[PDB]
Amino acid sequence: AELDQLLQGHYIKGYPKQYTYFLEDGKVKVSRPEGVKIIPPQSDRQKIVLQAHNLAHTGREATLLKIANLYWWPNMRKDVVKQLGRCQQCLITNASNKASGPILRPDRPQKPFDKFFIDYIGPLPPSQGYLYVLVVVDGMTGFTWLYPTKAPSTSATVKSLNVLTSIAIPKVIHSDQGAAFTSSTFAEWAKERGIHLEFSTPYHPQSSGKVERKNSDIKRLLTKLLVGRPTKWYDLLPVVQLALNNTYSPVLKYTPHQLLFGIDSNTPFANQDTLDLTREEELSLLQEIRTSLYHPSTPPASSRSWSPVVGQLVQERVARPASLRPRWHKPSTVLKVLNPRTVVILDHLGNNRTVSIDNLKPTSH
Amino acid sequence: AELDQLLQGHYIKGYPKQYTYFLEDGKVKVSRPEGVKIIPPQSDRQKIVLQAHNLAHTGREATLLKIANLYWWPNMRKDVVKQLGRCQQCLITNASNKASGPILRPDRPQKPFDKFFIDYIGPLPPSQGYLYVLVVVDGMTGFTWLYPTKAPSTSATVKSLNVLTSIAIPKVIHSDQGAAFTSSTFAEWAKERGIHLEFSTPYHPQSSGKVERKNSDIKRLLTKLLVGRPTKWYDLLPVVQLALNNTYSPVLKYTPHQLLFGIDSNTPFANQDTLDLTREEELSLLQEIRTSLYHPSTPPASSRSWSPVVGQLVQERVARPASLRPRWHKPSTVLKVLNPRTVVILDHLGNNRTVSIDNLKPTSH
Amino acid sequence: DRPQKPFDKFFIDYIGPLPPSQGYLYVLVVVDGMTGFTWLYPTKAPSTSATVKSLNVLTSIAIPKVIHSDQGAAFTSSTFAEWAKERGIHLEFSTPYHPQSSGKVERKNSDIKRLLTKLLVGRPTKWYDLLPVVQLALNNTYSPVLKYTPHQLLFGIDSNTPF
Amino acid sequence: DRPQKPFDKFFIDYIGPLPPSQGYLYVLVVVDGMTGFTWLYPTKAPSTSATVKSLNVLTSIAIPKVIHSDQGAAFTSSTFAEWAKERGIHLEFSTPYHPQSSGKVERKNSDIKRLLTKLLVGRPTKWYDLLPVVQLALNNTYSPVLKYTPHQLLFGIDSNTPF
DNA sequence: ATTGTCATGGAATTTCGCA
DNA sequence: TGCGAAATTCCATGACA
DNA sequence: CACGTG
DNA sequence: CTAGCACGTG
DNA sequence: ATTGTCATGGAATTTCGCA
DNA sequence: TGCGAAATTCCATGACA
DNA sequence: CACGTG
DNA sequence: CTAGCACGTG
Ligand SMILES: [Mn+2]
Ligand SMILES: [Mn+2]
Ligand SMILES: [Mn+2]
Ligand SMILES: [Mn+2]
Ligand SMILES: [Mn+2]
Ligand SMILES: [Mn+2]
Ligand SMILES: [Zn+2]
Ligand SMILES: [Zn+2]
Structure with a gap:
């Protein structure tokens, strides 16, 4: 009916007058330099765009090309992108073309014992019946303690850290969300000593970068010292630990x-x-x-980076997605921006969650 | 003895005259703005540099600082780096700070069937008793065939490719060095048909990029189509294969x-x-x-990239290094530069080998 | 009125039974109308099921506007109609007892039957294995x-x- | 003639036997000369072996120029000498029957023994578990x-x- | 409801030894 | 007050995850 | 025993 | 967190 | 004795509709 | 022959390994 | 059975 | 090529 008026020489916002619109075989057509295309009613465009899209679940231009093989209507891509922003299958499966914001270079802890970093290296080749190393890096200095354990237990962590706290008690202890750090047993052990537990955002080891980076020089030294030699690292930990703390x-x-x-x-x-x-x-x-x-500055934001805004629609990377399973949870909302790199959202299980934007993509369209 | 002449007010190339060199407690010393340092004989510097280095197997400046806590001699770093280029432990364990050359964007095959790309996707969730997909991508067009198999056999590859060659015979078939492609059975199957086997450099899947990249759109479509649904991909392969070849x-x-x-x-x-x-x-x-x-151009060379020169000393990344094992084979020599991204070397087992510079680092020092 | 293109019509018949080569008895012949390009598929019978299975392979590669056949049970089943409808292929039929292929195709199945004959003579039960080569020739003559x-x-x- | 620094001398004795708290009977006392900083290590005996094991922990953190002790068998073994030599630590000894620590240390082990006593009174066999806290106090007084x-x-x- | 980091070695740069 | 060499600093790269 | 985090 | 698995060759 | 590739969607740019 | 909108193109990013 | 490549 | 394993919590 909207197209009836075209045939009555009437102008309709978006339909260029210079073109000749007409009827042929029960369809309204239009001669274009592209060729002769069909102008479907508004009532059928949503379906048509859906039809073209679902062929290969193709992106914007790839879907547009399909449609433009046959049809023409004003601002097709608008009618295209509207559905792209609603095809849950594409929203949850397609990857992002936005790089995260530039990293924060947090202030180095002011004094020693202001903040510890703790992590587990391992498993390793069993040396003396031990498999893991609890690494403790002092934030300010980088002075590092290396404790060998048989398991990444809560027990082995406490039973090591007590030896360390003997020297001194730290304000904050930082760590990934490994079971031994997130357990109640440990949370409480920290409370006895007025230690505040800081926790890194999940699936983001760079947040425990201080220690992970120390893990390198530890592993790297261990490796050099065991060249052409069996892997008995236990007897070498102290050797390394001294060697590294004075490097x-x-x-x-x-x-x-x-x-x-x-x-x-x-x-x-x-x-x-x-x-x-x-x-x-x-x-x-x-x-x-x-x-x-010396304090590292925040690096330049990528040419096409994205920073999180409150209320903005965003989705969280699926941790361990199965084979042939979408790598993104359904879209969530940004509740609180802790910093240009950290966000509180409302996760897919209806919970409050603090994630690094590294594990987020801004929902497209 | 060389230092005796210093004490006899004699100038020696490298020892600045303005400084006062003297003897104290059986050692030749020198008052520096750094402090008072010892000038050991040439005969002991190699040992001293070795002593300082082996503490943490530290790099250049980290070793220099150790030595400069006590000693001074002209061009210490020269005497330092000389040993760095010979500590096998560091040569084979330390990582590179040189990025590879910029990638080649090879000419797209001229006609269809000029070159195939073949690869195996899988294993996958068993669908209809099948686990793998043999992907065959036509070089020029990207037209892709998808064959389901139970194993990445030589058998399943031939038994699939025969169905494909039925349509037409390809000049060249390109592929990683997967067992089914490198077997004699297949090499010979190719010879019957006057098919030339091209082989990608090992541990370098981007060389089979044409197909690996197609693997994405294949996996990605499969994923979208199995959302909220069990993973029965077999019945969907043709669907995808058509859908993709026309996208x-x-x-x-x-x-x-x-x-x-x-x-x-x-x-x-x-x-x-x-x-x-x-x-x-x-x-x-x-x-x-x-x-x-359209032809993609070679990207800008990284600010600190390295391109291989014949005769240059280089080392090959250890494929699967064990835990706590060096990630580099001993230094090898560049025999033939096939292109700024490909090299023939002389490997650690005394063999001729063609590797991508991605799996090489230029031996430092 | 519009110049003929590949895929515009695919012609089929079966050619069988043949001597059991590795278990296959018939051969579904697909030929493109315009180019004369030919696809052979060894099937164990000329049922719609073997036909569908084989064309399911072809229609992964390309899909024709029309499939033209004679009135074999394989081609006139209700199933086969439902099969073509789902894919938007039209089914045209030759009038019974009156082949209505085309000059190009007429000679083509001629060329195929003449090709197939050599195999019965030379290789009494190895024809199956050689279907690809035949198909190559047919497509390279x-x-x-x-x-x-x-x-x-x-x-x-x-x-x-x-x- | 040169101002005293931490690590310049580490003083030791044992303090034991004590009531068996979880199996530990003696306590190796390490005190830094200049700061008066104190490290305690519960050992099951005052052998060189328990001493070495404990100092092997300490000498991972820091290594002193001198270790000053009395003439206990634990400290005068051939082994312990070979132990200190390998690490470049000098071993100085107090003349037998004549403690030669220092004012700071004298009061320190005083402060430790006085500290340890409270534990024997209050906690008859729970002293082991509290060594860290003691060590904290000693280092925080x-x-x-x-x-x-x-x-x-x-x-x-x-x-x-x-x- | 928190945040990347640092040893490394060529190259770029600043400093030094001598007039 | 300048010039060449030597020593220092810069910094992209990669590995720890 | 399954799920989350590592 | 890193172990596996597959295949085809001596 | 070989070599990265391409769908993707905001942004940058070029083109189009109308005077 | 210029102006605003709409359509096209660019292109960094990520995934396939 | 181990090794290489995936 | 991708499966595992560890741990601690309902
Ligand atoms: Mn961890
Ligand atoms: Mn492969
Ligand atoms: Mn017939
Ligand atoms: Mn005593
Ligand atoms: Mn970690
Ligand atoms: Mn692959
Ligand atoms: Zn979609
Ligand atoms: Zn070294």
């Missing part, structure tokens, strides 16, 4: 031990510059160092 | 079927533009299309 | 009326297996 | 002669567990 970070030009104490212990090639100074005279300088350290 | 590539603005035949079959939303033309008039146009297609 | 072989008409390129 | 507690002298920061 310079060229950027800082200090070693983790140095950053923690302000002076070298009786280790080889020990720095003696503060030997003239009194401990006070040398402990002052250490306070300056720890502040006058 | 436009927006860049080309043609579909694989089109590129192969020059006209659409009796599929939905079929392009009818050549309907006025004769087959000859339409088959000519198809020859123009296939040539006037 | 040149043409008088047209200067081209089907493999040049269907693909627009010279074959790498010419005859 | 302030000082007269110096304005600081060890945890401020060893780390240069206020503790998050002060006493």
Whole structure:
């Protein structure tokens, strides 16, 4: 009926007048430089776009091309994209072409014991009946403790950390959401000591980057030391742990031990510059160092990055999707933006959830 | 003895005169703004650098800092790097900070059947007692055949490809070095038909990119079509295979079927533009299309990339290194540069080998 | 009134029974109208089921506007009609006892039957295994009326297996 | 002539036997000379082996120039000498029957023994479990002669567990 | 209802030794 | 007050997940 | 025993 | 978190 | 003795409808 | 012969391994 | 049965 | 090529 008026030489917003619209074999057609196409009623376009799309569940232009092989109507892509934003199958299966925001480079913890980082390396080749290593990295310094365990138990974590807390108690302990860290047993162990548990966003190990990155130099040293030799790493952990805590970070030009104490212990090639100074005279300088350290800047945002806005429609990457299963949960809403890289959403199981935008994509269309 | 002449006010190339060199506690020292350091003889520097290095098997500056805590001699880093280029443990364990050359964008095969790409998808959730899919992608067009098998056998490959060769015989068949493609049984099957077997460099699936990339759209479609539904993919393969072969590539603005035949079959939303033309008039146009297609250019070389030179010392990534095992074979020599991305070397087992530079690093120092 | 294209019509018959080569007795012959391109499918019987199974393979590669056949039970089943309808293929039939293929096709099945005969002579029960080669020849034999072989008409390129 | 630093000397004795708390009978006392920082290690005996095992833990964290002790068999074994030599630690000994620690340390083991006593009174066989807390106090008690507690002298920061 | 990090070695740059 | 060499710094790359 | 996180 | 599995060749 | 590729959807750009 | 809207193109991103 | 490639 | 395994919670 809307098309009836075209045939009555009447102009309709979107239908260019210069073109000749007419009837042939019970259909309204239009001669285009593309060729002769059909102008279906509005009532059939939703169906037509659906028909074309469901062929290969094709994207925008790939669906448009299909339709444009036969039909023409004003702003087809509008009528296309409207359905793309509603085909649940494509929304949950298609990948994103938006890169996350640029990473945060959080402020390095101010003093030692301000924040620990804890992680488990392993399993490894059984050495002395042990399989895992609980790595504890001090936030500010990078001074690292290495405890061997038989399992990533809550037990082995406490039974190791108690030896460490003996030295000193840390304000915050940071860690992925591994079972031994998320258990009630541990949550409570932390409460006895007035330790605050910080937890990394799930499926995002870079949040425990401090320790994961230390895991490298640990594994990498272990590897060099076991070249052409069986893998008995247990007897080597202390060796590595000392060796690493006293290994310079060229950027800082200090070693983790140095950053923690302000002076070298009786280790080889020990720095003696503060030997003239009194401990006070040398402990002052250490306070300056720890502040006058180097801070990485936030990297440039990718040419086509996306930052999360409250209320915006977004979806969470499916953790372990089965074979031939969509890699995205249904669209969720952004509740709270903790920072340009962290978000509280409303997950698919009707729960509150804090996720890194790395495991999100902005719902397209 | 070389240091004796310093104490005799004599200048020695590299030892700045302005500094005061002297003896104290049986050692030759030098007052530096760094502090007071020891100038060991040449005969002990190799050992000293080794001593400092082996602490954590530290890199350049990290080893230098250790040494510079105590000693000073002209061009320490020269005496440092000399050993870094010889510590086999570091050479084979440390990662590279050089990105590969920029990728080649090889010429798209000229005509259909000029080159096939073959690959195996799977295993998958057993559908109808089948587990794998042999994907065959035509180089020029992208027209793709999908054959279901129970195993990535040589048998299942031949027993499928014979059905395909029935249609036409291809000049070249390209594929990774999967057992079924590298077997004598297949090599010979190819010889009967005057098919040349091309083989991708090992541990480099992007060389079979044509097909791997098709694997996506295949898996991705399969996934969308099995949403909220058990995974019975067998009955869907043909559906997908048609659906995909007739799905436009927006860049080309043609579909694989089109590129192969020059006209659409009796599929939905079929392009009818050549309907006025004769087959000859339409088959000519198809020859123009296939040539006037789009060709991706080689991307900019990374700011710190490396291209292989003949004779240059290089090492090959260890395929499956065990836990705590070095990820690099000992240094090998570049014999022949097939292209800025492909190399013939002399592998660690004393064999000739053709590898992609992606699995190489230039031996440092 | 509109120039003929490939896929515009697919012609079929069965050719059988033949001597049991590895268990196959009949052969479903598909030929494209315009190019004369030919697909053979060894089936164990000329049922609609073997026909559907074979065409299910073909119709994964290409789908024709019309499938033209004679009035064999295989082709006139209710099933086969329902089969073609779902895919938008039209079913045209030759009047019984009066083959209505075309000059190109007439000679083609001629060329096929003549081709198949050589196999019965030479290879008494190895014809099955050689269906691909036959199919290659059929698709690589040149043409008088047209200067081209089907493999040049269907693909627009010279074959790498010419005859 | 050169101002005293942490790690410059580590002082040890054993303090035992004590009532068997979970199997541990003695306690290896390590104290830093300059800061007065204290490490306790529950050992089942004052052998060189328990000593080595415990110091093997400490010497993973830090290594002292000198280890100063009395002439206990644990400290004067050939083994223990070979143990210190490999790590470049010097072994100094107090003249027998004449403790030669220092004012800071003298009061420290005083502070430790006084600390340990409270545990024998309060917790008859639960002292083992509380070694960490003791160690915390010892390291968090302030000082007269110096304005600081060890945890401020060893780390240069206020503790998050002060006493 | 939290956040990437750092050893590495060529290259780019700044500093040093000597006038 | 400048020039060449030597030492320092920069920094992209990769691995830890 | 299944699910989540690693 | 990293072990597996498949295949075809000596 | 070989080589990455392409569907995707916001954004950048080119084209179109009308004067 | 210019202006605004609409359609086309570009292209970084990610997945196939 | 182990190794290589996937 | 992708399956596993570990742990701690309902
Ligand atoms: Mn972990
Ligand atoms: Mn493969
Ligand atoms: Mn018949
Ligand atoms: Mn004693
Ligand atoms: Mn981890
Ligand atoms: Mn593959
Ligand atoms: Zn869809
Ligand atoms: Zn090394």
